[PDB]
From a paper:
Ceg10 is an uncharacterized effector secreted by Legionella pneumophila, the causative agent of human Legionnaires’ disease. We found the uncharacterized L. pneumophila-encoded Ceg10 protein to reproducibly break viral restriction in LD652 cells. We then used limited proteolysis to produce a core Ceg10 central domain (T55-R287) that was amenable to structural determination by crystallography. Overall, Ceg10TR is composed of 8 α-helices surrounding 7 β-sheets in a conformation resembling a cysteine proteinase with a putative catalytic triad consisting of Cys-159, His-196, and Asp-204.
We determined the structure of the trypsin limited-proteolysis protected core (Ceg10TR) from three different data sets to 1.7 Å, 1.4 Å and 1.5 Å resolution, respectively. All crystals used for data sets in this study were grown from the same batch of purified protein, but the crystallization condition for data set 1 was 2.0 M sodium, potassium phosphate whereas for data sets 2 and 3 the major precipitants were polyethylene glycols. Interestingly, the conserved catalytic cysteine, Cys-159 (C159), is nitrosylated in two of our three structural data sets, indicating that this cysteine is highly reactive and particularly susceptible to oxidation by agents such as nitric oxide. In the S-nitrosothiol structure, the carboxylate of Asp-110 is hydrogen bonded to both the nitrosyl oxygen of C159 and the sidechain of Trp-206. In the S-nitrosylated structure, Asp110 also hydrogen bonds to the nitrosylated-C159 and van der Waals interactions occur between the aromatic ring of Trp206 and the nitrosylation moiety. Analysis of the electrostatic potential mapped to the surface of Ceg10 and RavJ reveals that the catalytic site of RavJ is buried while the S-nitrosothiol of Cys-159 in Ceg10 is solvent exposed. These data together indicate that Ceg10 harbors a highly reactive catalytic cysteine that may be critical for regulating host responses to infection. To date, of the >215,000 structures available on the Protein Data Bank, only 43 deposits display an S-nitrosothiol group, highlighting the unique nature of this modification. Furthermore, to our knowledge, Ceg10 is the first structurally characterized S-nitrosylated Legionella effector.
Numbering used by the authors: 57 to 247, 254 to 284
C-alpha cells in the first residue's frame, strides 16, 4: 500500500535527486568549502533521526505520531510570548526528542544544529537562512549551500548566482520565500524582510535553554 499521505510522488523525488546529483558532480570545492560540505552532509544525516510521514517512502502509520509534533509546533508558533528564534528552536527540540516531524520540523532541526555549531570558536558557519517553496522548507548555509533534510539532499550554490542551482533543482516548485535568517553580524530577520530585534536579545537564552547540554545538538568530529 503506497503512503496515502505522500506530498510528492516517487517520480518527483527521483527527478529532484537526479538534478542534485548533476549539480554535485559539477562542483569542485576548495579545502575550506569541503570542510563545511562534510559538516552539512553529517547534519543532514543526523536529521534522519526524525521521521516524516509525507514522503512516498515514509510509513503512512507514522502520521499520528508526526501529528503530535505538528500540534506542538502550531501551538508554539501562535504564542505571543516567545520570540521567533525561541519558537523555531523549541520545535527543533520537540521534533528531535519525539523522533517525528515533516519538512518544517526537520529544517528547524538542522538550523538548530548548525546554530549550536556556530557558537564554537572559528566555526565555519557564518549565516543561516530558512526559506520555503510554498510549504517545502530548506536551509541555506553561508549563502553557499542548500540543505534539504526532508529529502536528505544538499548541494552547493554558485557564488553571486545562487538561483542557478536552486532554479534548476527546484524548477516548478515555485518561488523561494524567506522565513527566518541570522546573518554573520548576529542580526535576525523574519519575513518583505523585517529585522527581529527580540530574537537577537533572546539569542543567548535560546542557545542555552534549548540547545546546550543536549547530545542531539552537539557534534564532536569537528
Ligand atoms: Cl564548525
Ligand atoms: Mg563558507
Amino acid at each position: 500500500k503506497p503512503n496515502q499521505y505522500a506530498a510528492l510522488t516517487h517520480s518527483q523525488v527521483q527527478e529532484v535527486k537526479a538534478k542534485v546529483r548533476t549539480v554535485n558532480d559539477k562542483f569542485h570545492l576548495n579545502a575550506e568549502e569541503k570542510k563545511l560540505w562534510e559538516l552539512i552532509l553529517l547534519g543532514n544525516q543526523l536529521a534522519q533521526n526524525i521521521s516524516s510521514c509525507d514522503l512516498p517512502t515514509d510509513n503512512e502509520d507514522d502520521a499520528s505520531l508526526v501529528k503530535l509534533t505538528q500540534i506542538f509546533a502550531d501551538e508554539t508558533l501562535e504564542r505571543t510570548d516567545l520570540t521567533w528564534l525561541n519558537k523555531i528552536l523549541k520545535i527543533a527540540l520537540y521534533s528531535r526528542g519525539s523522533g517525528f516531524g515533516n519538512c518544517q520540523e526537520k529544517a528547524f532541526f538542522v538550523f538548530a544544529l548548525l546554530l549550536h555549531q556556530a557558537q564554537k570558536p572559528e566555526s565555519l558557519i557564518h549565516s543561516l537562512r530558512l526559506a520555503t517553496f510554498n510549504n517545502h522548507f530548506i536551509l541555506i548555509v553561508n549563502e553557499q549551500f542548500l540543505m534539504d533534510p526532508w529529502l536528505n539532499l544538499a548541494f552547493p550554490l554558485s557564488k553571486g548566482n545562487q538561483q542557478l542551482e536552486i532554479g534548476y533543482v527546484f524548477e516548478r516548485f515555485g518561488r523561494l520565500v524567506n522565513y527566518f535568517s541570522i546573518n554573520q553580524e548576529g542580526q535576525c530577520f523574519t519575513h518583505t524582510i523585517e529585522r527581529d530585534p527580540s530574537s537577537e536579545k533572546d539569542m543567548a537564552n535560546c542557545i542555552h535553554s534549548l540547545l546546550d547540554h543536549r547530545d542531539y545538538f552537539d557534534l564532536s568530529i569537528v
